[PDB]
Design a binder for this molecule. Structure first.
Ligand SMILES: N#Cc1ccc(CNC(=O)N2CCOCC2)cc1
Length: 281
């Protein structure tokens, strides 16, 4: 059981060592499309690339490339798109992906500015009366409502396909309190946030996969999916203690490289799952 494994690693301070074994066991697949010279300005970080086999393709004939990966967790019935924070030139591609994949929710785990640098383009409208038009992808986005709480903001957005005049409602879940350095002290507000996303229906199989991002789409984004999948597997299995976080993480790393960036994010993932299990047993 992971509570006991947690105490072992913690008491022994072996987190950097566990983390290194995961790094060494992790899959490595080609990412040829990401490294094409015509795609250089579609990537925020040169060392963070989607694998060719799991990459999301845009339905535009010119250039189908976006830095985004489909994570498919077959047993858990869960699929996630993990992507980078959009760039000024890819905001239109981002919303095209949301449209094409029939996603109901966008989960954002960063602030637009952190450590005095921009981590993400402002890709949603700040006021009801000032909608955004993405000329390159023929989409219109309107802020319908905004509910600001202490730890997160939920926004209702209307996305309109200007080509066909279909409209969809998108929910934007914005976790606003992840600190500039390190991880939250307690996982309570992160779990609250994860249960709010679940309650919305955004993670349900009726819809396309949820879009999850931070800056690179691997660190905080990774913690989100790992905690959700682990808690789901503990509800589904005859023996909840047969859930090995390390085996789940390695499975997700077949779909996108570098999920969980630091030994601290790994420790935080254990703590989130351990604490979330109490609200689930
Ligand atoms: N969705 C999902 C998902 C399921 C399994 C894994 C890793 N394998 C695993 O946990 N086991 C349990 C013990 O017997 C079989 C292998 C990762 C993700």
């Amino acid at each position: 059981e992971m509570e006991k494994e947690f105490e072992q690693i913690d008491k022994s301070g072996s987190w950097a060592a566990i983390y290194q074994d995961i790094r060494h066991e992790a899959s490595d697949f080609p990412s040829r499309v990401a490294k094409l010279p015509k795609n250089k300005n579609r990537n925020r970080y040169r060392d963070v690339s989607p694998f060719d086999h799991s990459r999301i393709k845009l339905h535009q004939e010119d250039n189908d490339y976006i830095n985004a990966s489909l994570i498919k967790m077959e047993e858990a019935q869960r699929s996630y798109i993990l992507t980078q924070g959009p760039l000024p030139n890819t905001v239109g591609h981002f919303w095209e992906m949301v449209w094409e994949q029939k996603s109901r929710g966008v989960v954002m785990l960063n602030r637009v500015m952190e450590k005095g640098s921009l981590k993400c383009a402002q890709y949603w409208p700040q006021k009801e009366e000032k909608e955004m038009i993405f000329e390159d992808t023929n989409l219109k986005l309107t802020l319908i409502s905004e509910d600001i709480k202490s730890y997160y903001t939920v926004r209702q957005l209307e996305l309109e396909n200007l080509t066909t005049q279909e409209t969809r409602e998108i929910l934007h879940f914005h976790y606003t309190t992840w600190p500039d350095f390190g991880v939250p002290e307690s996982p309570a507000s992160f779990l609250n946030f994860l249960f709010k996303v679940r309650e919305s229906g955004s993670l349900s199989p009726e819809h396309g996969p949820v879009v999850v991002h931070c800056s690179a789409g691997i660190g905080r984004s990774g913690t989100f999916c790992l905690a959700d999948t682990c808690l789901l597997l503990m509800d589904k299995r005859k023996d909840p203690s047969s859930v090995d976080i390390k085996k789940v993480l390695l499975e997700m790393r077949k779909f996108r490289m570098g999920l969980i960036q630091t030994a601290d994010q790994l420790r935080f993932s254990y703590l989130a799952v351990i604490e979330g299990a109490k609200f689930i047993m």
